[PDB]
Paper text:
Sirtuins are protein deacetylases and hydrolyze one NAD+ for each Lys residue they deacetylate, which links their activity to cellular energy levels. The conserved Sirtuin catalytic core comprises a Rossmann fold domain and a Zn2+-binding domain. The substrate polypeptide occupies a cleft between these domains, with the acetyl-Lys in a tunnel leading to the active site. Here, we show that resveratrol can directly activate the deacetylase activity of Sirt5 and inhibit the enzyme’s desuccinylase function as well as Sirt3-dependent deacetylation.
To investigate why resveratrol-like compounds activate Sirt1 and Sirt5 but inhibit Sirt3 we also solved the crystal structure of Sirt3 in complex with FdL1-peptide and piceatannol. The asymmetric unit of the Sirt3/inhibitor complex contains one monomer. As in the Sirt5/activator structure, FdL1-peptide and piceatannol bind in close proximity and directly contact each other. Peptide and piceatannol form crystal contacts to a symmetry-related Sirt3 monomer, resulting in π stacking interactions of the coumarin fluorophores of two FdL1-peptides and an interaction of the modulator with both stacked aromates. Piceatannol binds perpendicular to the coumarin rings, similar to resveratrol in the Sirt5/activator complex. The hydrophobic binding unit is completed by Phe294 and its symmetry-related counterpart Phe294*. Additionally, Glu181/181* participate in positioning of piceatannol by forming hydrogen bonds to hydroxyl groups in both rings of piceatannol. An overlay of the two complexes shows that both acetylated FdL1 lysines are bound in the hydrophobic active site tunnel, but the neighboring fluorophore/modulator pairs are differently arranged. As a consequence, the entire FdL1-peptide is shifted in the Sirt5/activator structure relative to the Sirt3/inhibitor complex, positioning the acetamide group deeper in the hydrophobic binding tunnel. Although the inhibitor contact to a symmetry-related substrate molecule in Sirt3 is likely a crystallization artifact, the Sirt3 structure shows again that the resveratrol-like compound can bind on top of the substrate and directly interact with the C-terminal peptide fluorophore, apparently influencing the substrate binding mode and presumably thereby inhibiting the subsequent reaction step.
Numbering used by the authors:
A (entry chain F): 1 to 4
B (entry chain A): 122 to 157, 170 to 393
Write the structure that this text describes.
């Protein structure tokens, strides 16, 4: 889920 | 309403014992690394995978500039090393890729390098891992490091745009509810998922920002136990150290680590  | 001295008394009194820290570019400009010629179409291309596959040299130039030996940690980093040595540091979340948290002697187990690290590298094709020393010679020698099995480009484990944050980022699920003090130094945490993380500590938890200005979710969605120490981050850190009675330990630590 969490991306840069 | 809480002041810097109240936060200091909370820490001195050990009523604050599990400090979660979040840091960004503002703690590293005093080491001489700026925020934000390189042969780049625009700034962000240095951390995009398609550009990188097409021209890896500008990234490798930055890597050479950031490898150990170019910069040293400053009072900011050493203040954080001190929290660790005094048994107060639950986790340190950094957006920096300069590695100075680990250089300041904070152990890896205490760090979430949310934008990754030069300490290790990964073949971009077959996904084989390599210690970052293994490509060091090539980067220092302006050669593109190549996988000794598939010939793929071997890239340091810097997180690029659109990549998942590192696996250790998951620790936020446990650290943030466990935090009894949130310290934000040298970043506004403007962008997701860092923004919402400031919102993930319990309502009873002081949030202390040492930063140029009051910006980000501390400005946008304040809580009653928030503190802003605005201005020079180094000056703010020093005021806090000074209220904690850690002046002599700062000096001891800094000279042990850096000569003087
Ligand atoms: O400046 C850039 C350059 C680039 O090449 C990609 C991105 C973002 C990519 C991305 C962001 C979020 C996602 O969820 C995803 O699948 C991909 C940003
Ligand atoms: Zn490979």
């Amino acid at each position: 889920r969490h991306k840069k | 309403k809480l002041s810097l001295q109240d936060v200091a008394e909370l820490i001195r009194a050990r009523a604050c014992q599990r400090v979660v820290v979040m840091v960004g570019a503002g703690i590293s400009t005093p080491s001489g690394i700026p925020d934000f010629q390189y042969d780049l179409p625009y700034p962000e291309a240095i951390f995009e995978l398609p550009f990188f596959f097409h021209n890896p040299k500008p990234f490798f130039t930055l890597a050479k500039e950031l490898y150990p030996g170019n910069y040293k940690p400053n009072v900011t980093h050493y203040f954080l090393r001190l929290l660790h040595d005094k048994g107060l540091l639950l986790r340190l979340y950094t957006q920096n890729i300069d590695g100075l948290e680990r250089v300041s002697g904070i152990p890896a187990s205490k760090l979430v390098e949310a934008h990754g690290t030069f300490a290790s590298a990964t073949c971009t094709v077959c996904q084989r891992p390599f210690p970052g020393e293994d490509i060091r010679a090539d980067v220092m020698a302006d050669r593109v490091p190549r996988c000794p099995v598939c010939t793929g480009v071997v890239k340091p484990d810097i997180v690029f745009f659109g990549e998942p944050l590192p696996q250790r980022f998951l620790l936020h699920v446990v650290d943030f509810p466990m935090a009894d003090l949130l310290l934000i130094l040298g970043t506004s945490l403007e962008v997701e998922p860092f923004a919402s993380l400031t919102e993930a500590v319990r309502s009873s938890v002081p949030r202390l920002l040492i930063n140029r200005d009051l910006v980000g979710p501390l400005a946008w969605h304040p809580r009653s136990r928030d503190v802003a120490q605005l201005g020079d981050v180094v000056h703010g850190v020093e005021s806090l150290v000074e209220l904690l009675g850690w002046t002599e330990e700062m000096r001891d630590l800094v000279q042990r680590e850096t000569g003087k």
